[PDB]
Amino acid sequence: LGQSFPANAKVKYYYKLSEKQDLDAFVNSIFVGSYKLKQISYLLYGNTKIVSAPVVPLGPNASIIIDDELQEGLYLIRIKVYNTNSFSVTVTPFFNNNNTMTYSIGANSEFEIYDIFTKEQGNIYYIQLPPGLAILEFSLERVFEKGNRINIPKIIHTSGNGYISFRLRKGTYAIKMPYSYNNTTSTTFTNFQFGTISTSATIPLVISSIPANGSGSGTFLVYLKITGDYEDVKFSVTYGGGLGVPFTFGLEVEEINELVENTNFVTQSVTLSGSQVTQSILNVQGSGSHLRLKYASVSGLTTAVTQCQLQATNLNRSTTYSTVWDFIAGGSSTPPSWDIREINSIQLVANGGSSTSSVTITLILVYEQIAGELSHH
Amino acid sequence: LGQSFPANAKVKYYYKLSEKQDLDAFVNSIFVGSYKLKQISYLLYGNTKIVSAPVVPLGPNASIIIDDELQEGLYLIRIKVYNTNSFSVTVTPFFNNNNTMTYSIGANSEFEIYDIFTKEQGNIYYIQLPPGLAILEFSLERVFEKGNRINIPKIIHTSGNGYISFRLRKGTYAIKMPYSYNNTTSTTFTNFQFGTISTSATIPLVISSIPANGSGSGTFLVYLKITGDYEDVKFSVTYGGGLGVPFTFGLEVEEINELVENTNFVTQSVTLSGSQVTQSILNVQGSGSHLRLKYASVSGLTTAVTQCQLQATNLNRSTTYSTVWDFIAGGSSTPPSWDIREINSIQLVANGGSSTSSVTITLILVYEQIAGELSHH
Amino acid sequence: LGQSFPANAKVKYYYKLSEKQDLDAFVNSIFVGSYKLKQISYLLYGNTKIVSAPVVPLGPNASIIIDDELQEGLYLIRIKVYNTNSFSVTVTPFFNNNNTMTYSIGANSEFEIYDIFTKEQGNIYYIQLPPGLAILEFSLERVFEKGNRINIPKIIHTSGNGYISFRLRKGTYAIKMPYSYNNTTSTTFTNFQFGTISTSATIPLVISSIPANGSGSGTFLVYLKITGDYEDVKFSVTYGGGLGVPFTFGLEVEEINELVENTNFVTQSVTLSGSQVTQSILNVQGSGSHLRLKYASVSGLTTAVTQCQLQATNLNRSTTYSTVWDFIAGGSSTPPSWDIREINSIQLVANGGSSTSSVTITLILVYEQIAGELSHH
Amino acid sequence: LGQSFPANAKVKYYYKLSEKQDLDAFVNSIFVGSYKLKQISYLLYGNTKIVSAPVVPLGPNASIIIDDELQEGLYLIRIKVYNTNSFSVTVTPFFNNNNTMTYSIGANSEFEIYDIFTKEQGNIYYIQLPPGLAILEFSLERVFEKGNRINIPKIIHTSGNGYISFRLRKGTYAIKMPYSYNNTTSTTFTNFQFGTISTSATIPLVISSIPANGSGSGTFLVYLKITGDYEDVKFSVTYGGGLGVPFTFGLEVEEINELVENTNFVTQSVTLSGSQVTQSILNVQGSGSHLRLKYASVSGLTTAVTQCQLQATNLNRSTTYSTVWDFIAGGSSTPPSWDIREINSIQLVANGGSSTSSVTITLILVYEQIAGELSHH
Amino acid sequence: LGQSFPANAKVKYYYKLSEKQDLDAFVNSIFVGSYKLKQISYLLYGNTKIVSAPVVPLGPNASIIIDDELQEGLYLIRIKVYNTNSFSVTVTPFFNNNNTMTYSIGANSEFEIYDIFTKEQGNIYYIQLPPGLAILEFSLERVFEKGNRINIPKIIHTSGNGYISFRLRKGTYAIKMPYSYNNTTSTTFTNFQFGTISTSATIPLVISSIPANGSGSGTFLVYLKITGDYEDVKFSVTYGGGLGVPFTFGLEVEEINELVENTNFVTQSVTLSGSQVTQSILNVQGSGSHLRLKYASVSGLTTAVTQCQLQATNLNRSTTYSTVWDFIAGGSSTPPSWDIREINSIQLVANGGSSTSSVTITLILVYEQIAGELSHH
């Protein structure tokens, strides 16, 4: 199955394979297998574009393999191809660690293969190309330069497994995945987990309900705050290869400015009767967002209350909550300079009252919910 | 109507078609149709510039078509042409989504065709060029690099329909459209909607009045805050093709720094007599702006008032208002750290008093109005 | 007076005209007229530099004219020339809109012609060069790239009119103009307006006094805050062509970080006797600066005072003042979160007292004066 | 041991040595010694890549030495090699200051040599290459351009000494070092110091425990705030060459945005009985973090307390603490604007009470702990 | 002493003079004088690098002179040379304004000449090279691009005069100068001023004491806040040419992020007895730093105090202090929003009490000292 290939020539970041000098370099550097040069024609707004391009001949798949020392960074790869066959063919994009998800390329048509490649730690780009595909252009470009984003249309097919990985430098990002599915089973799912997005922090991609035998479409939209100390992002399809619910999805990854999703004044009562109570106020871990606390106050405090502490943490960093305000020691409301950032869970720990005489206290809290899942540390 | 064309050569980002090597590449990549090479002369400050350039011959329009894998981004296209005809000709710029708006190119004159092209998702650039146009230069440049802006002069003609789309990366932008119109009808129009600017959020472009049989000019100026999760912007002319009010307009799109349009101390009374009241305080949705709340206070509170909550939202994200301060639970005025950002609508919800004994409360509010329509989420 | 010229060749951003290939391109693209190639010598630190360069021959002026689709942006142009004449020659730089201000180039000397050119909306660069000038180098570079500034030495001559325009992207800029003048009149000028700097907002450049028959020097230094929605800046000399006060000046335009010019606690009393009073507190419109209010308080309020509102505005945006604090409705002092930005004029509107019993109130205000004239909106 | 070498040719930032013109330049500039050109084959995804590349022949090691005036900055070097020997060979990377730590390159295999080189003050790059190594590619790239990071996999071998140095421009950085160790001794270690990271400020890299005869893996993760006045960072392995605990580690250096590790409300009592007490509250010097104080308050103050001052400092800058709040002179709690940044140690100095009548005061403090060791000044 | 030189060829930003085409350009553009091509050898890690390079022959010094229109900006020049003489030679770097300070280049050794060149306003680079120096490479690179800094090692010799000038764009910068001195005199110095750093603002570089006949070393480290309106920085050695205290020093200029040097709570009493008192609180003008005031309070105010104003200024901008808080008119302590930036001198002006009954008031102040001398305006 393996073949030998000559690889002496310097790699280019762009090839138009209908140019002789680009083709000559391509097949002495990153192309594996043989090719036949053919005249290729396809329609553009009713006009017929005609080029001579290399076509993969009958036999084993060809490959493109790049181990050269490209400039490090995250590349969007675009391969312009034309399927000369009268039947569909499939391609399995690299996506750094995919080997199951596919593109379906229709008979007698031009098609854009999108791929993603992180050049770090000697990573080697690899993709196989089936017989009858003409290769017209091959493009390597770094994304997140000059304000570009990853924007892959809804063409990625999965049947329950697959991976896409990419490195993100510091910043906050939106990851958007338009999808369509076709449920072929008689099973009704509720809270169907399609997949997860994670750094070393995990965000589940969940659909409220997928009706039996139904088809539908929607969009996943989540946000990651990349502090910068954990840059490798991993998307995994988790619902399981044999389920019978094929999805087709797109992938958009783009830098955003701060997004305050909402700001809220909230109130929570706690009744104390002799025992310590730990009351969750808010937990947005795994949601694609985090919190910022601006103000807190507790009413109903009496000498019968022995403990009343507001605690918070970044659960992706630590499961141990730290006290951010002590209403007994510090007073019934937070001072003007009090501002709690980079947390995603808040609880109130209180104690007091008796088994015969309970005390009810009321916490009020003003907080912002801000886009971006917090990373591990 | 369709023609075949050879497209083997690598596309360039700049062509001067009076250079042989540029012309040769141009007509083996992106130019459809035949040309005649002619000596072209035109005036610059009284001097006669003379070049040899390709001219579209009598017959079908020529086209420029680009499906090549250009670096992704938003391009400003400039085509320098010279109309060799003794009559005006028209061109229909691509603008990503336009096929009705035109440029009018005068007889025997040089002209700059401006176009806009978003290279994402395999988008294909397309423009037709009529017989007698000489094509002198063709330029592709990314805007919003190096602090550039889109700046098209007042030369775009519409008679009631048309579209222009473009991708904007994160940032706040001004969109300015200088216009002139001629109302050839005997009808005077009020709150005339010329068009809309939208992302997935909508801003109407409205003219207070257009006098019957009148002609006039003005400038639309609106702002978009692109968080970055919705980047595709769409301008639509909506007044209707057969109306009889031709407009000529320009388009300037440029990044801005934060613009505080004004800061205001405002007061609002509400009379309560037993029933819940929901009182709108401010709603700037669709205005090209948003709000920031700095301080609020309510006077006149008594035990007769059972509810008094200030609520706010980004209506482009959610029609459900969230409470941002509760004057009963939290006290009659907001604390120093209270600061409500990224909203565009505010209301007061209150209840109390009786059918026989009403209570009047007064809200005071300090807020900023900030340039930039908020996007959907 | 007009001549024809061949313009087939691609324009370059740098030419050294003593190189044959640069000269060949230059005279087949942007140079109008004939030249004579001559050996040119001039002194550098006592050494004689020798080059062969094109010289404008006896006859009509030559021109440089550039209408090609250069990358858009603001260019600083430098032309290195050598005056082979035994007499002075003058050149009139383009400066986008100038046709009266001049450089005076001494006999038998090297000289740097600085020019400014905004490549937007098909703008065409144009400058004439008199006989006997050798053209050594021609340089086009974008400024405000890589932290560069416009820095033209004190060599620009005006006798009372002239214009320089340039586009500035978003940011705050200093505009500095070192000048010398010779008053050839016996008139003592008081508050002599030399010129103005404006966007669509105007800053007068004023000298306190110019003594009769006097000669002097100084520096204008003003600042513009370019929000980004109005980028075209225009400098105009306004004192009048026949006045008899020639100036020579330089031009430095450079981006700055925020500059707090001063912060002040100020007090203002107002006496009320039955009628509404509108008292100006501060107005810095047209000064090259704006204001930020941090704190305000009014003492002396009694039930005899019926109105006491602090109002502010950006006069370049609106002549209608908005209330920023109401001391009656809101209380005698501003809250911690009160912060009024982007204004340049403040007034107090008050009413109360009677014709027989006046009331005196005292406003205190803390504000910053910040560099940068606010733009129109 | 030393050899002469020709070095006339300009240095390149990238060489692919299977290209004749790159090899020719390489061996007339930076390569020392002889080479034999050989056909080299190795496996990539089951395919056989074949190139002709220079191999170090039997005899003395070859060297690469670069003293040329490269653009200044910090370079990541990658050398793609292939070990043609049937035995392992070792290489000692430059790392600016290393001459003991090694890579181990397996028999008959391709390997990526990573190195680091700071081009400042005439620094000269140097690495030796043993016989039988084929050199395929040599890459010099600046890191921290375009959001790149240093990311070297876990392949660096130390047995108790070694240095790596690099220059960081202003910013905050994470330094992450995944490691594995093998303790060959019967000795049990506690608070094992592997090494230190320092600027002119020192951060110990410590392992809680290394069990006797144990092997283990973990990750060091520390942060440096580079103000910019001290840019040269030095990593030192300190545990001692003969210890018998070999480590293998990786190195990741990347820029981060502000990281609030946690925010805490803390309380501390101090009992006074006639003598001055200096009570440490918090000291995070050498931890890879610093502090920011937001609010402080002291309860229990009476006329019996004569001194109560909160003091802070950046210990890397100064061992003398400065008073940041005086609870006697200033009052029992800090004002809204009180905010103490860029410190890493806090203490309370207090005095009062008597030998017969003690007074207990309680300090409460709200502070953030922020990633980044503070530098010296 | 002056020579003629041919200068037709375009200037390059990098020359390796052992390449024929680089040398050919070099000696037809910027090199003045004759050269002899010689085989040059020197040691690098025990290996002998051999190149053929131009050597200045016996006779007058050669010169490098550059008046060409290089891209504007601040350049670091590196000249790699080799002294073929068996005696030391000296070179005088340009440094924009130097003509006394020298490098000493040892016999038979390679050496890096560092120089600084501001390309603005037609500035011409100039340096003389003595007989016997081989010139191997010549490099022109803009600093402050890509996060580079000026970093010249301790090799600049002065005996009491000399200048270095450079342009800095907006930012805050550290200027670090490691130095060594030899006092050949038995004079012991106190507060020895070595030199000054200034913009149009001045910072003295002072050494506490220089013992008689002593030698020593140390480092000057000061900071400049470049707002951007004054960008030209001048370093002057001022101690005087004949003093007999030679220094050798290096120069490091690098951009920094905000540096809070310290934050302090300070107290100051003032006794009033009928006369106005102006009490200096803090003055850091000329120190390389500035202040920011966060909070102020005065205790001891009575009706016997008629004036109590805190005043501040940027003395580099204005010698007139402005009132920043009036404790009589405004109250005994500053409000939460009070924050005074960009000042470097604070005083309290007070009046009250009588010749027979004095009043003592106490000011408390919290302020930050921040790196960066403020510039003139």
Ligand SMILES: O=P([O-])(O)O
């Ligand atoms: O390498 P990029 O895609 O992060 O710029």
Ligand SMILES: O=P([O-])(O)O
């Ligand atoms: O791959 P990392 O960036 O999570 O270490």
Ligand SMILES: O=P([O-])(O)O
């Ligand atoms: O950095 P933030 O705005 O995501 O909290």
Ligand SMILES: O=P([O-])(O)O
């Ligand atoms: O791709 P641009 O046009 O957003 O820079």
Ligand SMILES: O=P([O-])(O)O
């Ligand atoms: O395509 P979007 O970026 O406007 O959702």
Ligand SMILES: O=P([O-])(O)O
């Ligand atoms: O981010 P802004 O547009 O609410 O200031």
Ligand SMILES: O=P([O-])(O)O
């Ligand atoms: O075009 P520039 O001068 O704004 O860079």
Ligand SMILES: O=P([O-])(O)O
């Ligand atoms: O020319 P503008 O920048 O005022 O539209």
Ligand SMILES: O=P([O-])(O)O
């Ligand atoms: O943006 P600023 O200049 O109002 O601070």
Ligand SMILES: O=P([O-])(O)O
């Ligand atoms: O030189 P760099 O790697 O610091 O950008």
Ligand SMILES: O=P([O-])(O)O
């Ligand atoms: O090595 P430095 O960056 O501390 O001077």
Ligand SMILES: O=P([O-])(O)O
């Ligand atoms: O320098 P900071 O923002 O990390 O405290």
Ligand SMILES: O=P([O-])(O)O
């Ligand atoms: O011109 P630079 O060296 O300031 O970037």
Ligand SMILES: O=P([O-])(O)O
């Ligand atoms: O030369 P400047 O930048 O001090 O005006």
Ligand SMILES: O=P([O-])(O)O
């Ligand atoms: O930010 P600063 O330098 O004005 O204190």
